[PDB]
Design a protein around this motif. Structure first.
Motif, PDB file in Angstrom:
ATOM      1  N   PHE A 183       0.843  -1.188   0.000  1.00 30.10           N
ATOM      2  CA  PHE A 183       0.000   0.000   0.000  1.00 30.10           C
ATOM      3  C   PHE A 183       0.881   1.241   0.000  1.00 30.10           C
ATOM      4  N   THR A 184       0.539   2.207  -0.847  1.00 23.20           N
ATOM      5  CA  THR A 184       1.281   3.455  -0.895  1.00 23.20           C
ATOM      6  C   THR A 184       0.901   4.343   0.288  1.00 23.20           C
ATOM      7  N   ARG A 185       1.716   5.377   0.512  1.00 24.15           N
ATOM      8  CA  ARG A 185       1.473   6.281   1.633  1.00 24.15           C
ATOM      9  C   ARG A 185       0.154   7.026   1.471  1.00 24.15           C
ATOM     10  N   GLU A 186      -0.204   7.378   0.234  1.00 22.82           N
ATOM     11  CA  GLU A 186      -1.432   8.134   0.005  1.00 22.82           C
ATOM     12  C   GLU A 186      -2.665   7.331   0.401  1.00 22.82           C
ATOM     13  N   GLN A 187      -2.688   6.036   0.076  1.00 20.48           N
ATOM     14  CA  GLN A 187      -3.836   5.209   0.434  1.00 20.48           C
ATOM     15  C   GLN A 187      -3.985   5.087   1.946  1.00 20.48           C
ATOM     16  N   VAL A 188      -2.878   4.879   2.658  1.00 22.15           N
ATOM     17  CA  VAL A 188      -2.954   4.704   4.105  1.00 22.15           C
ATOM     18  C   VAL A 188      -3.294   6.020   4.795  1.00 22.15           C
ATOM     19  N   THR A 189      -2.663   7.117   4.369  1.00 22.85           N
ATOM     20  CA  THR A 189      -2.746   8.362   5.128  1.00 22.85           C
ATOM     21  C   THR A 189      -4.120   9.014   5.008  1.00 22.85           C
ATOM     22  N   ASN A 190      -4.668   9.086   3.792  1.00 26.35           N
ATOM     23  CA  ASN A 190      -5.884   9.858   3.554  1.00 26.35           C
ATOM     24  C   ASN A 190      -7.030   9.016   3.001  1.00 26.35           C
ATOM     25  N   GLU A 191      -6.961   7.690   3.129  1.00 31.57           N
ATOM     26  CA  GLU A 191      -8.075   6.824   2.759  1.00 31.57           C
ATOM     27  C   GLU A 191      -8.383   5.731   3.772  1.00 31.57           C
ATOM     28  N   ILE A 192      -7.528   5.506   4.769  1.00 28.78           N
ATOM     29  CA  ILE A 192      -7.699   4.388   5.691  1.00 28.78           C
ATOM     30  C   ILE A 192      -7.858   4.899   7.118  1.00 28.78           C
ATOM     31  N   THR A 193      -6.892   5.684   7.589  1.00 31.79           N
ATOM     32  CA  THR A 193      -6.934   6.267   8.928  1.00 31.79           C
ATOM     33  C   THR A 193      -8.056   7.296   9.090  1.00 31.79           C
ATOM     34  N   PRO A 194      -8.435   8.037   8.038  1.00 32.71           N
ATOM     35  CA  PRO A 194      -9.643   8.869   8.156  1.00 32.71           C
ATOM     36  C   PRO A 194     -10.882   8.088   8.541  1.00 32.71           C
ATOM     37  N   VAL A 195     -11.017   6.835   8.103  1.00 38.93           N
ATOM     38  CA  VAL A 195     -12.177   6.040   8.499  1.00 38.93           C
ATOM     39  C   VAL A 195     -12.205   5.875  10.013  1.00 38.93           C
ATOM     40  N   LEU A 196     -11.059   5.526  10.599  1.00 39.50           N
ATOM     41  CA  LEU A 196     -10.956   5.427  12.052  1.00 39.50           C
ATOM     42  C   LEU A 196     -11.302   6.754  12.717  1.00 39.50           C
ATOM     43  N   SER A 197     -10.645   7.831  12.284  1.00 40.99           N
ATOM     44  CA  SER A 197     -10.842   9.144  12.958  1.00 40.99           C
ATOM     45  C   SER A 197     -12.296   9.612  12.858  1.00 40.99           C
ATOM     46  N   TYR A 198     -12.954   9.375  11.724  1.00 39.32           N
ATOM     47  CA  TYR A 198     -14.300   9.885  11.511  1.00 39.32           C
ATOM     48  C   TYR A 198     -15.385   8.937  11.996  1.00 39.32           C
ATOM     49  N   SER A 199     -15.018   7.691  12.314  1.00 37.97           N
ATOM     50  CA  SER A 199     -16.025   6.696  12.773  1.00 37.97           C
ATOM     51  C   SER A 199     -15.942   6.499  14.290  1.00 37.97           C
ATOM     52  N   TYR A 200     -14.810   6.847  14.909  1.00 39.96           N
ATOM     53  CA  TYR A 200     -14.666   6.585  16.339  1.00 39.96           C
ATOM     54  C   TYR A 200     -15.852   7.134  17.127  1.00 39.96           C
ATOM     55  N   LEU A 201     -16.215   8.396  16.891  1.00 37.35           N
ATOM     56  CA  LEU A 201     -17.310   8.996  17.649  1.00 37.35           C
ATOM     57  C   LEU A 201     -18.659   8.429  17.222  1.00 37.35           C
ATOM     58  N   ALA A 202     -18.825   8.155  15.924  1.00 33.54           N
ATOM     59  CA  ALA A 202     -20.074   7.577  15.444  1.00 33.54           C
ATOM     60  C   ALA A 202     -20.318   6.200  16.042  1.00 33.54           C
ATOM     61  N   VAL A 203     -19.249   5.467  16.358  1.00 35.41           N
ATOM     62  CA  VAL A 203     -19.411   4.189  17.041  1.00 35.41           C
ATOM     63  C   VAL A 203     -19.572   4.397  18.543  1.00 35.41           C
ATOM     64  N   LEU A 204     -18.858   5.374  19.107  1.00 32.01           N
ATOM     65  CA  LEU A 204     -18.909   5.610  20.545  1.00 32.01           C
ATOM     66  C   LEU A 204     -20.291   6.052  21.001  1.00 32.01           C
TER      67      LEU A 204
END
Length: 390
Positions: free
Chosen positions: A36-57
């Protein structure tokens, strides 16, 4: 019930925190296996975690009290197992996004444990059990970090083998969670209105309100400093050494917090003010350091900051649980965590963003030190006003 109610609970927390491959998820994705390239991990994968944490909490704290705290712990364990299964079997970006969503579920489902410790034991033992559980959790985190680093640096295991070890430990943690004593149905439990009204009535109390404001604001400052401490130094072996020492000191201080004998009605605000002032000083120490031969002092300051926060955390949890005359400890825990995350995001958007007051990392840490100083000053003023109205 004499030993496998508290000792087993601490063991379950310790072994649930054991994830050697958790700290190497990003290098694993940016490796020969996943490719996986840096672009896929940085701005397509970790954003899911950051933006879903509260929606799950948001549903997590609403449901953990009603379903009792054992199903949510089992769900967290199964979600960690799913995270590592997707890590070992995911190929596309969507699989990694689903893995990050499950990881957000896992991070949101720790208030279930933090309250289950109180739900299990008599209120007269809330302080010691809170210290024991936090100490076990932080010892598990430290052991997982040390085990992963040893396996990847001095050990010659690959990221795949390390993730297999983590998956085996998560399976054992799920097995352990399957034997957790589910509390009683409880007299409590639209139901939403009932829990909201009880939350308001309990927040009317002074001891719960004082430690809920600490949870919202001191934890937000804690997570701002902890998350941005890695970028501040990077802007390496010693960084992991600092993190592990911080975690170990946090475990020791959490264990000690269950033994302190303080009248938590006159010196509760003073203790918070003193700890917050010390944390402000330590964050200023982390910020205002630029000498190359001074990084030991910076690491010591970070370790002491984490130790102070993890010393006050079990006290906050025990004081919140003891001040709640209802089976809604996890609801308050989750509300405090949600508001702390909201405050952390707001301060991140202000201090660290082009739209906001854009500043470098050193100025960010200076702002965090000023924020901690403001919190300390507010707590000192509150303590003085409380002591004046004796």
């Amino acid at each position: 019930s004499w030993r496998h109610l508290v000792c087993y609970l601490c063991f379950y927390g310790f072994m649930a925190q054991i994830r050697p491959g958790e700290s190497f998820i990003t290098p694993y994705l940016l490796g020969p296996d996943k490719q996986f390239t840096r672009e896929q991990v940085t701005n397509e994968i970790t954003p899911v975690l950051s933006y879903s944490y509260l929606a799950v909490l948001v549903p997590v704290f609403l449901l953990t009290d009603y379903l009792r705290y054992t199903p949510v712990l089992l769900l967290q364990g199964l979600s960690f197992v799913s995270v590592w299964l997707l890590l070992l079997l995911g190929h596309s970006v969507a699989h990694m996004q689903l893995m990050e969503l499950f990881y957000s579920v896992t991070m949101a489902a720790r208030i279930a444990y933090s309250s289950y410790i109180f739900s299990l034991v008599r209120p007269a033992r809330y302080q010691r059990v809170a210290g024991y559980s936090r100490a076990a959790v932080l010892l598990g985190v430290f052991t997982s970090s040390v085990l992963g680093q040893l396996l990847v640096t001095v050990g010659r295991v690959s990221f795949s083998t390390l993730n297999y070890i983590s998956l085996a430990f998560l399976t054992f943690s799920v097995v352990l969670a399957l034997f957790l004593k589910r509390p009683k149905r409880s007299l409590f439990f639209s139901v939403l209105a009932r829990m909201l009204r009880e939350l308001g009535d309990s927040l009317r109390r002074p001891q719960l309100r004082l430690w809920s404001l600490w949870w919202v604001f001191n934890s937000a400052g804690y997570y701002l400093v902890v998350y941005y401490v890695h970028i501040l130094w990077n802007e390496r072996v010693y960084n992991f050494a600092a993190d592990a020492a911080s975690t170990l000191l946090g475990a020791i201080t959490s264990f000690a917090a269950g033994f302190v004998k303080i009248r938590w009605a006159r010196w509760s605000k003073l203790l918070i003010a003193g700890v917050t002032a010390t944390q402000a000083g330590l964050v200023f120490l982390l910020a205002h350091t630029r000498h190359p031969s001074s990084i030991w002092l910076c690491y010591a300051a970070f370790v002491l900051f984490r130790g102070s926060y993890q010393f006050l955390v079990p006290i906050a949890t025990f004081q919140i649980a003891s001040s709640l005359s209802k089976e809604l400890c996890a609801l308050v825990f989750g509300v405090n965590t949600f508001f702390a995350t909201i405050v952390k995001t707001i301060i991140t958007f202000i201090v660290s963003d082009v739209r906001g007051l854009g500043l470098p990392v050193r100025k960010q840490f200076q702002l965090y030190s000023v924020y901690f100083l403001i919190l300390s000053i507010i707590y000192f003023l509150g303590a003085m006003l409380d002591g004046l109205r004796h």
